[PDB]
Design a protein around this nucleic acid. Structure first.
Ligand SMILES: [Mg+2]
Ligand SMILES: [Mg+2]
Ligand SMILES: [Zn+2]
Lengths: 46, 124, 98, 147, 201, 245
RNA sequence: UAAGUCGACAAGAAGAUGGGCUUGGAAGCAGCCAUAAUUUAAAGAUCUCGUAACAGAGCACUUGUUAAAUCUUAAAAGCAU
């Protein structure tokens, strides 16, 4: 995982999602990829 | 005479067979008509150019009639019906297929560029 | 649609009959190598005079012999029925591997 | 699955060697049986001539191959009468856009498009368009075409 | 949703029962939204769900079909639950009729699985326990939830069965959590044809 | 300069975009449905380029053997086994049948000089054709009685067509023996005389092409009727026998 | 955008040809030069992986199936993260 303020897709298999959002926190924007795990990124800090 | 190679010439190295002689050219009259048209597919100085040609191309405009200066829409972007009529005769059918094929070559030429351009944008 | 678990097929339809749309379409999903792999295929054309009950006979490699109705069922209904049996044949063959 | 191999070899010079040895000796076919049949299907050709071969190795390693006419490039160069170069083979222009190694009249193009149509897989292609394809290759191997 | 519009074909033997809108009083909420209780019964068993009331079901008996619709397509909440409620029903129907199955493949030297009983830790009478030897100092034992049937055709293969898919795949993931597939040799537990790309060496 | 109201003469207003392959095909299959008097509708099932080229190699060989001392133009070079876009090829059949260009009231269009000149929009991609096809297709049972209604069931799935500039049974019989042989009427070519026909690539393709029907002089036909038309020795000869009576 | 948009799925994605040079090898895919043609429903002398080099898997592109009757894609702007 790489934490950036500017998360970008690096291939056609990367997807933008917002996870860990619940009734207590807003969550983070993620770049998830089933092809290359080196594309995994998170926007925002805990 | 139109041929640079007269009859009887020996074509170097075109007989890979054992019990044979290298091909020998024949008279130009026997040769098919299409052969002599095959080569249709072969497609300071700027100051002098922009000095005379610019002056020559000016009067070439002759903007008294604008219709001749139309955008010249390509054949792949028109909407006019193609030359096809019911029971119009074999000649109309033959001359119709030639235009249907004439349009295919245009869409082809445009597809090639779209493919080349797409590849360029992808390896930039 | 999966075709690995198919070995034989037989089709009879009248082309001018709108009910045969599923039969003419069923052969659309068979791959090119089907004839060479060993799948036996057979299709017959009925005269336009009048349509006879179209018969789309299927047979897997396990001995199952399906005989589906082409008129009342659509291509979508005929594809999933072949997906069901072709799936258990893979899971059974998956757990039986080794 | 049935594999296929591309290998250019001499007319009757089939034998376990750089060309044939590592090309087919790797897949497990009877390399000696191949060189014995190829030499029988290529006797009417001049010894040493190049001949493209497409050998389809079926499962169980039972191969069947089909020899093909020599490359059009090898024919255009032999027709243009280009100067021999490295390895004792006629070489083409290293800069086709500028350099010009030879000139072939359109009569040569007619001849080079008829021994290529001799094939059974190319016997249907009209000879008209088949003569404009070699002209499209001459521009690539640095050869001019005279009417 | 292009899925919610799709009618649901009720196969023979399956029976869908739709209740009337009801609200259970909650002392912590001032207003509970009504819901409908849908019961899908058949040969293998029975399943129940509570759907929102804005989802309308036109159950056709003589035709054996049931299409879902919402009261307002322009509401985000109604669009979402339209396809979700349709997907859950499609699983309920196909689970009570045929049943859902999951296959676990154990890859590795010494990985085995056996189905036996543990009367000392059984949560209910006759509970089966899947015992796994996964290279750990201790044995791994997991009890199958009530409503599932586990088996082992081979020592290195497990087969789960049940009418609830969410319960089946959740249990398969509970077993896979002990040995997650590794990329260097492929050792681990694979669920339903799961594969993993290997590495260079 | 050119004004805004002006529209080019070779690009009149059409129902939908013009440069798209969806419309350039509709403009093509309409002319193809008008000129070509005789066509057979095939069904192709996942062939490869090598198989396609092999099938098209036998046609060329089988169509080049027919004798043409009639002085008429060479027709062999204009017969083609073409794959079509079935979704659009079905629209082109309605347009050719329902649309009537005579029901268009002309309108004056402004040229580059701004002068209003009468111009009637009759092309097949016109909104008048798009409108007449839909309104005429509303009725369903009335369509089954037309020529389009009798052919729509064939234009389902992937299909190819073999066109012929003229109704020459001598040319069709040579093509039917290569694509849909029914011996002894249309016997396939011999093995001693045509070894190419019985090759792995060629033979592996003909098993995927299934002739389904035809269309002759704006009339639908079946695999049984095509045989009879092909059975005609000669058009003029068929007329002479009628006169001998 | 029912002339079926969008997505998925199925199959196809040719031939001259292994373009010429370079190189131990360079076959679409180290590098250099060229990149008018040809035939097709379409197919870059080649966009991404892969091979020592071939082979092989995808893309551009092509047809078919499923399927939307206010439901495609993009840009700008406002307020938010
Ligand atoms: Mg190269
Ligand atoms: Mg490389
Ligand atoms: Zn990625």
């Amino acid at each position: 995982m790489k934490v950036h303020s500017a998360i970008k897709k690096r291939c056609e298999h990367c997807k933008v999602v917002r996870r860990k959002a619940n009734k207590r926190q807003n969550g983070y924007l993620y770049i998830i990829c089933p092809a290359n795990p080196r594309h995994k990124q998170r926007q925002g800090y805990r | 005479a139109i041929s640079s190679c007269p009859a009887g010439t020996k074509l170097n190295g075109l007989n890979y067979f054992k019990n044979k002689a290298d091909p020998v050219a024949l008279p130009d009259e026997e040769y098919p008509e299409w052969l002599w048209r095959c080569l249709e597919v072969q497609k300071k100085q700027r100051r002098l150019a922009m000095k005379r040609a610019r002056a020559q191309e000016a009067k070439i405009l002759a903007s008294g009639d604008l219709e001749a200066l139309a955008p010249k829409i390509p054949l792949q972007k028109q909407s006019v019906n193609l030359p096809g009529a019911v029971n119009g005769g074999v000649q109309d059918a033959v001359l119709a297929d030639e235009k249907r094929e004439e349009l295919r070559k245009a869409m082809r030429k445009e597809r090639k560029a779209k493919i080349k351009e797409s590849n360029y944008l992808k390896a930039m | 649609m999966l075709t690995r678990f198919i070995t034989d097929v037989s089709t009879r339809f009248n082309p001018f009959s709108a009910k045969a749309k599923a039969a003419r379409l069923f052969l659309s999903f068979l791959p090119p190598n089907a004839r060479s792999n060993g799948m036996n295929i057979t299709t017959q054309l009925l005269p336009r005079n009048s349509t006879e009950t179209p018969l789309l006979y299927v047979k897997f490699k396990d001995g199952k012999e399906m005989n589906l109705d082409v008129e009342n069922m659509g291509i979508k209904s005929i594809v999933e029925e072949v997906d069901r049996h072709s799936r258990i044949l893979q899971k059974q063959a998956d757990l039986n591997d080794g | 699955v049935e594999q296929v191999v591309k290998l250019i070899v001499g007319a009757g010079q089939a034998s376990p060697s750089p060309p044939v040895g590592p090309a087919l000796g790797s897949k497990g076919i009877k390399s000696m049986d191949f060189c014995k049949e190829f030499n029988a299907r290529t006797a009417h050709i001049n010894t040493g001539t190049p001949m493209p071969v497409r050998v389809t190795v079926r499962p169980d390693r039972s191969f069947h191959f089909d020899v093909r006419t020599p490359h059009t490039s090898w024919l255009l160069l032999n027709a243009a009468e280009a100067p021999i170069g490295k390895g004792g083979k006629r070489k083409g222009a290293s800069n086709p856009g500028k350099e010009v190694v030879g000139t072939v009249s359109l009569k040569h193009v007619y001849e080079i498009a008829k021994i290529k149509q001799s094939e059974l897989r190319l016997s249907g292609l009209p000879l008209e368009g088949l003569c404009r394809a070699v002209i499209y290759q001459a521009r690539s191997i640095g050869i001019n075409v005279i009417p | 949703s292009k899925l919610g519009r799709t009618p649901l074909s009720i196969p023979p033997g399956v029976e869908i029962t739709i209740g009337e809108p009801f609200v259970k009083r909650d002392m912590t909420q001032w207003k509970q939204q009504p819901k409908r209780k849908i019961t899908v019964q058949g040969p293998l068993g029975q399943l129940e769900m509570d759907i929102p009331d804005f989802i309308k079901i036109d159950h056709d008996a003589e035709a054996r079909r049931a299409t879902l619709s919402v009261a307002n397509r322009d509401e985000k909440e109604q669009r979402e639950m339209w396809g979700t409620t349709w997907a859950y029903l499609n699983r309920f129907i196909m689970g009570v009729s045929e049943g859902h199955t999951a296959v676990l493949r154990l890859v590795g030297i010494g990985y085995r699985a056996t189905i036996d009983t543990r009367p000392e830790k059984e949560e209910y009478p006759g509970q089966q326990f899947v015992c796994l030897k996964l290279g750990f100092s201790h044995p791994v034992e997991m009890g199958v939830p009530k409503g599932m049937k586990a088996s082992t055709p081979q020592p290195t293969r497990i087969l789960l069965e049940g009418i609830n898919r969410e319960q089946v795949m959740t249990f398969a993931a509970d077993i896979r959590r002990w040995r997650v597939p590794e990329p260097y040799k492929g050792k681990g537990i694979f669920v339903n044809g799961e594969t993993i790309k290997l590495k260079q060496k | 300069r050119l004004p805004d109201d002006y529209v080019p003469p070779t690009q009149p207003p059409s129902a939908r975009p013009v440069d798209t392959r969806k419309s350039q095909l509709l403009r093509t299959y309409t002319s193809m449905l008008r000129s070509t008097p005789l066509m057979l509708i095939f069904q192709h099932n996942n062939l490869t380029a090598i198989e396609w080229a092999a099938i098209r190699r036998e046609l060329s060989l089988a169509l080049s053997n027919v004798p043409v001392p009639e002085g008429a133009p060479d027709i062999t070079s204009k017969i083609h086994l073409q794959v079509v876009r079935t979704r659009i090829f079905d629209v082109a059949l309605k347009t050719v049948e329902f649309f009537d260009p005579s029901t268009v009231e002309p309108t004056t269009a402004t040229t580059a000089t701004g002068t209003k000149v009468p111009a009637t929009y009759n092309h097949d991609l016109s909104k008048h054709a798009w409108k007449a096809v839909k309104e005429a297709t509303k009725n369903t049972e009335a369509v089954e009685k037309t020529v389009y209604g009798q052919l729509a069931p064939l234009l389902v799935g992937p299909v190819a067509i073999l066109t012929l500039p003229s109704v020459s049974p001598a040319h069709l019989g040579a093509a039917l023996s290569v694509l849909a042989p029914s011996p002894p009427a249309f016997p396939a070519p011999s093995r001693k005389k045509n070894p190419g026909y019985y090759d792995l690539t060629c033979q592996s393709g003909l098993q995927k092409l299934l002739l389904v029907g035809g269309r002759i002089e704006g009339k639908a036909f079946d695999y049984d009727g095509i045989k009879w038309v092909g059975g005609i020795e000669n058009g003029i000869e068929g007329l002479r026998a009628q006169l001998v009576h």
